[PDB]
RNA sequence: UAGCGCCGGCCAACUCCGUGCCAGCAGCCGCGGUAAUACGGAGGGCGCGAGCGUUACCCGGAUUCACUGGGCGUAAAGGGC
RNA sequence: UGAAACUCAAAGGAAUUGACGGGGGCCCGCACAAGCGGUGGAGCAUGUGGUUUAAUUCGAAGCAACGCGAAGAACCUUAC
RNA sequence: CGAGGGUAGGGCCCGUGACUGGGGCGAAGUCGUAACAAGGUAGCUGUACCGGAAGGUGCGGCUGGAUCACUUUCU
């Protein structure tokens, strides 16, 4: 375009998205889990996911994903989001975070023990 | 900070000999010398072409361990030499050079670079007739460098300084050794000190 | 939720038998799933078309398909060994 | 002709699939030999009275017996493994 | 006192066994339905080290708001005149 | 005039090879047309589907499976 | 003069919310054949009416249309 037409008009910014609304940007919030769930996947591949519905202190009710094999889960349990989604889960944007709330670790898993909440065994 | 752990891996894994060890390091009983297909199960199996990024990441691991220092020293120094006038390359091999556990072994007074770190770090080496305790220490020019009064009787340095006599030191050091001290008078230059090296692929490894 | 089986089910359910086990384990998986999940779950829960209307089929194996239909405490279950 | 399982029925059935295969091939061969015919063959077919009137049962081992009824081109099966 | 992450490509480091579109991994591309260098351990290797990884946010790469440095027939874009 | 939440790993332009056309032009083969017998009717032989049997061993599936593996099943052959 | 309060009226935002309207992702569900080859009536477009639905039709426009000039589903 012509300068002038920069002079008058101007470029605008991005105005990048959050995506992630965790209340203003922070890493974690603390929530409360409410229905515990295996939910199928999307469709390139089948699987059992295990999926835990939170609600969380800043009185959204958000999905998440417990990785890992296994868990301690119930409808009542005080729980650690992470942050990140998953692609084969539709509306699942977070991630749940082993190791230290009501949420157990995994038992037994030497690989990658700081992932997960695995102590050092022996 | 040091790398502590198997140091032949090293001579092996490169392909090309470091002498982090010394004495060993001309005897046939030399890791290279006797094996020098890399380690790991995976050594007689032929090796792909690398990336270019993966030589980059080989001459300057090779390089950082001739050396023995943490990674974190050898970016600071490497930004150090760069962000100053003159190549880049060829003063960052100076600063390297200049470096107290490095001179000593230069000096002779150690076989082995870990080992002149071990002597400089037990206060067994003194510069200007100061005792110093820490092997980053930068060595100017014309710093007189010796081992200290307390520390002559030393069985060790004794048979090093023993075997020391008749070798020729570098051209930008000089030595008494039978006053056992020795002198930096200048910074040393890529033709005066031959390396395994190219600098100029560390140079474009940390401008990634 | 009581077992409805045919003659070609069960006749291929032995053809199954005595050849290899896996195949088995894997219906006891399916049954197991569609006992606790019948529209859901593992092996990929999809129905039918034109001639088969008014069942449901889940992948087996990459080759093999189980066909079956869930009435009210009902689960019927036929052609264990065909490819659709 | 159309098998049926109950709930209970495959309990039992799974148990003695994961310990001894040769009395589920005896099984299989007393389902085939009632699959010939309704009311004869192994396992000396006798009726039930009031409590578990239509249904009859047959004989594995002394020790386990089988429940069964034949109506609408089916089989039933209760239990295979007790007494009753 | 030595630990942490990684070893399909991007990106440096490979094998066996266990598993069997399950359990799972995953930033993107995408792996898993019996030979899986991707899941889970083991061995081995790579990076860094009293740190090593993760999440969140900012800048970069992004010449992807282009003053340096973008375009508009058919990809988004010439206003009906 | 003119959004956002949510969602996707693409949507898109031109061009290459091929395939396809109830698109065209050109051209072959018992592919039609012209002709001679023939199947499908009947009785029997053989093979197959189905049903039954304790077993009717198994495979083969439109052209390109079905007087096919069988250029030789009374037991042998034979695996049921 | 004046913080503030009250009555009446006007506007705006937030939360809940009976009743609704459409949308996007997933499942080889059902009914169709709209479009890609002259998609089997060439297609597309503005408008108007009609229709379970894609869509049919009228009026006008475009070529980003073809080729030399009965009707026939779906995988
Ligand atoms: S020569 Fe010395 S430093 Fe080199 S591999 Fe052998 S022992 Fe190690
Ligand atoms: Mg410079
Ligand atoms: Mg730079
Ligand atoms: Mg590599
Ligand atoms: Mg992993
Ligand atoms: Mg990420
Ligand atoms: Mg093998
Ligand atoms: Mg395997
Ligand atoms: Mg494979
Ligand atoms: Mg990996
Ligand atoms: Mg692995
Ligand atoms: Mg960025
Ligand atoms: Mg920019
Ligand atoms: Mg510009
Ligand atoms: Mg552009
Ligand atoms: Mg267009
Ligand atoms: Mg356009
Ligand atoms: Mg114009
Ligand atoms: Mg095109
Ligand atoms: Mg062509
Ligand atoms: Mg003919
Ligand atoms: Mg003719
Ligand atoms: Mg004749
Ligand atoms: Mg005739
Ligand atoms: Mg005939
Ligand atoms: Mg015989
Ligand atoms: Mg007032
Ligand atoms: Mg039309
Ligand atoms: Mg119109
Ligand atoms: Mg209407
Ligand atoms: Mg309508
Ligand atoms: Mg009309
Ligand atoms: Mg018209
Ligand atoms: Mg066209
Ligand atoms: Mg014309």
Wanted: glycine share 8%.
């Amino acid at each position: 375009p012509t300068i002038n037409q920069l002079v008058r008009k101007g470029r605008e910014k991005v105005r990048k998205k959050s995506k992630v609304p965790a209340l203003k940007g922070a890493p974690f919030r603390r929530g409360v889990c409410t229905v515990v769930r295996t939910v199928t996947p999307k469709k390139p591949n089948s699987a059992l996911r295990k999926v835990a519905k939170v609600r969380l202190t800043s009185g959204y009710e958000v999905t998440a994903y417990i990785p890992g094999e296994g868990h301690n889960l119930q409808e009542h349990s005080v729980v650690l989001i992470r942050g990140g989604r998953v692609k084969d889960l539709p509306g699942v944007r977070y991630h749940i975070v082993r190791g230290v709330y009501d949420a157990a670790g995994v038992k037994d898993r030497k690989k990658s023990r700081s992932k997960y909440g695995t102590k050092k065994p022996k | 900070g040091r790398y502590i752990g198997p140091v032949c891996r090293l001579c092996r894994r490169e392909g090309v000999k470091l002498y982090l060890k010394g004495e060993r390091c001309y005897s046939p009983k030399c890791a290279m010398e006797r094996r020098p297909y890399p380690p790991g199960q995976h050594g007689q199996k032929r090796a792909r072409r690398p990336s270019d990024y993966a030589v980059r990441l080989r001459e300057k691991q090779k390089l950082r361990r001739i050396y023995g220092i943490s990674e974190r020293q050898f970016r600071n120094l490497f930004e150090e030499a760069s962000k100053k006038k003159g190549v880049t390359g060829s003063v960052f091999l100076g600063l390297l050079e200049s470096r107290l556990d490095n001179v000593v072994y230069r000096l002779g007074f150690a076989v082995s670079r870990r080992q002149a770190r071990q002597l400089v770090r037990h206060g067994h080496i003194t510069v200007n007739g100061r005792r110093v305790d820490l092997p980053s220490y930068r060595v100017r020019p014309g710093d007189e460098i010796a081992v200290a009064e307390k520390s002559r009787n030393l069985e060790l340095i004794r048979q090093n300084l023993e075997a020391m006599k008749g070798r020729k030191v570098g051209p930008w050091l000089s030595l008494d050794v039978e006053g056992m001290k020795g002198k930096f008078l200048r910074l040393p230059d890529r033709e005066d000190l031959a390396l395994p090296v190219n600098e100029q692929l560390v140079i474009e490894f940390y401008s990634r | 939720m009581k077992l409805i089986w045919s003659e070609e089910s069960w006749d291929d359910y032995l053809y199954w038998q005595e050849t290899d086990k896996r195949i088995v384990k894997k219906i006891n998986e399916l049954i197991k799933d569609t006992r606790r999940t019948p529209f859901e779950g593992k092996g990929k829960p999809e129905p039918l078309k034109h001639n088969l209307s008014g069942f449901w089929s889940r992948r087996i194996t990459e080759e093999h398909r189980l066909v079956y239909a869930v009435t009210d405490d009902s689960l019927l279950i036929a052609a264990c060994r065909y490819h659709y």
